[PDB]
């Protein structure tokens, strides 16, 4: 439909020019690459011109499973023994992970000072044509929900400009749930003079998004919430543990620490690591806690696909629907350290039908040859090959002429969960917000047009 | 109060950083100096950190006289003989003005094809050391009313950040009146397929503001209003007069031409002048018409101060209050000085002694044939502030 809708270069440029102005007028913006430390100039956030086609059934399935998925990862994060078991080996050959695990060990040894925590999740999916919905990533660490909403809103404007029906563009209000969840977390701390802290880099494209969150939180609190920004580097000097286990930022009590510095992604130096430790040992409500953040590493994602493992976290028969709904979104994955029957027959099928698999990258005849003659097995993993649905769209990026390209995407589904780490109870578990991230076959922001 | 409120460089920068982010998040923006033809990047509009002190009495006086002032200039614009009399001499030593006057002559000779017109006015004032003095009247290319509103809104945020009362910051909704007035003008043309045209430069800082007006007009019309942009240069090729005196933009009827290209300010070439003539001879509703635009030249401003001349345009005794209120604002002027911080892209904010001018905005929708007036509203204001400039808004005392 995108190619049919845009029938000339004149129309393309009128549409793009409207879109770019709309983006700036409505906060669909980022700091520039030249000045990631300054807000004096902004550029529009890179987006598709129109919302990419996406099947309704796959979308509704991804949305429907999300709350169950958040409950799963919350329970994983609460299961100290499972997490320590999952990390036993990789800690000995990854110093960064070792330090993070040691902070969780220190926090657990001293007893949980703050039971309330806020999980924030984006689950990523792709549409396999070799359509079926397949989970490809879970992110519980540093999570642009305002940008996603504004992208949906831009796309409705653009749909009207080409005479298309906007009812197939689904509602996208993830930022409202986020703000409410963060406000609820701050109220739960029980001190109206306690700070709300954005743990964040000095260099960041998304500063405008964070400021929007600040303004909304200040409005919700009727001006009572004091908001501050600090990095882990600056935090080494400015953050301290009080004698009552309060987190003190330059001597003032911190009620909530909302992190946009990825626990797994950011290679922190020794000082940054100590600042992280100070935060984790404090009684501040963490959004998210470190355990929540590392509950969704690739290792744990893989472990959760093994036989019987979902059932450990959903032991009751009343939750069998949640198990089935999550499992049917799993990508086929078979670690070759195991020599059980299901893995062995899988190896044989991959040798005979190598076009259907990937070995980790080996493909087709090379994959088959490697499986035939590899002794080496424990480090390799066999997976189902995924072929994404292709469509066509125009990308808007600052100073790039828009062109029609063949594109593929991933669906992101967002939500929050507010829970108690001591008894594993859940006060709030909501799916809200989504996005498409679209690339040529980093890519651009996008939103679904349901069919 | 500004100096007392900001008691450290650390606080100053936290406030400024909040303000700059707020500006970008809320559309208080301009195209960059490097790329006045492109919207890919934007900078925040230059503003004061806090609203400058301004006396309430002077402000209320400037607001109160505004509708009378719009009625005055509308009646001047309707008085063909007065305008031709006023320009008899200056046309012989100002070729630019001569060409504009000749277009009005050509339009008048053929009979007025479109009686409905929209006057848009900014009146500028300064505080003489206080008494309110009118220094300029602008009935040509106005714009920036959304920027003025957002500046007021930013200033309320900043007042709260330093614990000051926001009730002395007056309401600033000039953009709503503008949009309603332009929509009313478009409805009055009587053709739901007729275009709304922004007559505008390809290079312009305020493009974001115009797009905002477009979106609001599209919303008000329930998607029926088709909006286009054209310059006078491109207009020379793309605008024509139809055999029924319709203004045609690439063959499509134009219902309203809203101008942000100043009639008196922009030194137009021959082609641009012909495009202007084509617009003026058409039946499109002009916002504003050329007669309205040149009704507020410096020459006419001066002529309106001479004895008995206001009374020619307000002949009735029932309008004697309007005459007195306008005449009281007539004029060496020494402006009130205060202190403030300026926020400009890539400039560190510093405390300076500053002076300003008050701008008061409004619209008037009227009929050029019988001089009747359907709509006459003051709405919107601004401060423009300079070292003894930037956008600013008043803190009334």
Author numbering:
A (entry chain A): 8 to 137, 146 to 158, 160 to 376, 385 to 399, 402 to 467, 478 to 487
B (entry chain C): 8 to 136, 146 to 347, 411 to 467, 479 to 487
Question: What's in the article?
Answer:
Glutathione, the tri-peptide γ-L-glutamyl-cysteinyl-glycine, is the main low molecular weight thiol antioxidant in both plant and animal cells, often present at millimolar concentrations in vivo. It is synthesised in a two-step, ATP-dependent, process: glutamate-cysteine ligase (GCL) catalyses the formation of γ-glutamylcysteine (γ-EC) from glutamate and cysteine, followed by the addition of glycine by glutathione synthetase (GS) to form glutathione. Cyst nematodes have exploited a series of gene gain events to redeploy glutathione synthetase-like enzymes during parasitism, within the syncytial feeding cell formed in the host root. The most recent expansion has been coupled with a diversification of structure and biochemical function that has given rise to enzymes that are introduced into the host cell, and likely possess novel substrate specificities.
To explore the catalytic capacity of nematode GS-like genes, the G. pallida representative of Clade 1 (Gpa-gss1), one representative from Clade 2 (Gpa-gss5) and a number from Clade 3 (Gpa-gss12, Gpa-gss17, Gpa-gss22, Gpa-gss24 and Gpa-gss30) were heterologously expressed in, and their proteins purified from, bacteria. Remarkably, each stage of the evolutionary process that gave rise to GS-like effectors has witnessed at least a 10-fold reduction in apparent glutathione synthetic rate, such that Clade 3 GS-like proteins have not retained canonical enzyme activity. Comparison between Gpa-GSS22-open and–closed reveals a functioning ATP grasp fold. Residues in the ATP binding pocket of St-GSS1 are highly conserved in sequence and position in the Gpa-GSS22 structure (13/15 residues), and similarly conserved in sequence across G. pallida Clade 3 (structure guided alignment, ~12/15, n = 24). In contrast, there is considerably more variation in the di-peptide binding pocket of G. pallida GS-like effectors, yet, this variation is not evenly distributed around the pocket. However, the glutamate of the di-peptide is exclusively coordinated by interactions with charged side chains of residues in the binding pocket (R, E, 2xQ, N, and Y). All six of these positions are substituted in Gpa-GSS22 and Gpa-GSS30, thus suggesting that the lack of canonical activity is because γ-EC is not accepted despite the potential for cysteine to be accommodated. Variability in the glutamate portion of the di-peptide binding pocket is ubiquitous in G. pallida Clade 3 GS: of the 24 GS-like effectors there are 21 different amino acid compositions in these 6 positions, not one of which is canonical. In summary, conserved amino acids are only absent from one half of the acceptor di-peptide binding pocket. Given that GS effectors have no appreciable rate of ATP turnover when supplied with canonical substrates, yet all display perfect conservation at the catalytic arginine, we infer that GS-like effectors possess a distinct catalytic activity, which may involve alternative substrate(s).
